Amino acid sequence: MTAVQLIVGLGNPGPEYDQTRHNAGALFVERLAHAQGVSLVADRKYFGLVGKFSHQGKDVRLLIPTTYMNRSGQSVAALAGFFRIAPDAILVAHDELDMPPGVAKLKTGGGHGGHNGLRDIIAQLGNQNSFHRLRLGIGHPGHSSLVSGYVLGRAPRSEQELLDTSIDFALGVLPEMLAGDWTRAMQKLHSQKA
């Protein structure tokens, strides 16, 4: 029932982080911007890269924060407060240790389950966990202690391909996601296979 007004793709800025797994979110937004013909603008006001396109009579904004991951919430609150977008019109794309490459999933609400990007978003938005998430499988290294090194690495090529496939699947439910039909987007998405 609620149109999406903001899609955020999480990542770390900089060449040292480019192409790393923890930037899956931002890869998705970046593909989405390219497919939509949207330009993404270095906007210091929103501590990120911002673009917009028009969908069903409303501006949808795309955000890639350029704070570090752990401070993403600053970027998302600045944009969303400037524009008065409530959490429920926000979709955040992020890497997901709990699914393998090749798998994208959607979720509404819930915790951050250890993602410091989302945690920050959660704290910054006056503590609201009610935004939506596009979870992009990046696999898990199989030990809590290897997590930090893992999300910060570049996946081998098979895993990168399969992340890219999950991104193409995700983009196939763009119409359902922009409209806010999470159930249908879930039905279609969660029925694809990489």
Q: Residue 24 is part of a domain; what is its CATH number?
A: 3.40.50.1470
Select which of 22, 94, 115, 132 is catalytic: 22
With vertex at residue 57, the alpha carbon angle to CA 54 and CA 59, rounded to the nearest 5 degrees, is 40
CA distance 72 to 66: 8
Dihedral pair phi/psi, residue 172, rounded to 5° = -75, -25
Domain membership of residue 48 as a residue range: 1-194
Is 129 annotated to bind a ligand? Reply is no
Is 12 annotated to bind a ligand? Reply is no
List the 58-65 sheet strands across, edge first: 41-43, 48-55, 58-65, 6-9, 90-96, 132-137, 104-108
> Which residues, in sequence order, are CB contacts of 94 under 8 Å at separation 6+?
9, 10, 24, 25, 115, 117, 118, 133, 134, 135, 136
Is 23 annotated to bind a ligand? Reply is no
Residue 102: how many CB atoms within 10 A of its CB? Answer: 20
160 vs 33, 102, 192, CA distance in Å?
A: 19, 9, 18
The experimental resolution of this structure, in angstroms, equals 2.2
Strands, DSSP E only, in the chain? 6-9, 41-43, 48-55, 58-65, 90-96, 104-108, 132-137
Number of residues written out for the chain: 194
Four-point Cα dihedral 132, 78, 128, 149, nearest 10: 70
Residue 145: how many CB atoms within 10 A of its CB? Answer: 8
> Which residues, in sequence order, are CB contacts of 133 under 8 Å at separation 6+?
91, 92, 93, 94, 106, 107, 108, 110, 118
32-53 as b/e, with b when 16 or more CB fall inside 10 Å? bbeebebebeebeebbbbbbbb
Our answer to whether residue 22 is catalytic in this structure is yes
* Amino acid occupying residue 189: L
Count of domains in the chain?
1
Per the structure block, which two tokens stand in for 24?
């899956």
**Whether the Cβ atoms of residue 94 and residue 115 lie closer than 8 Å to each other:** yes
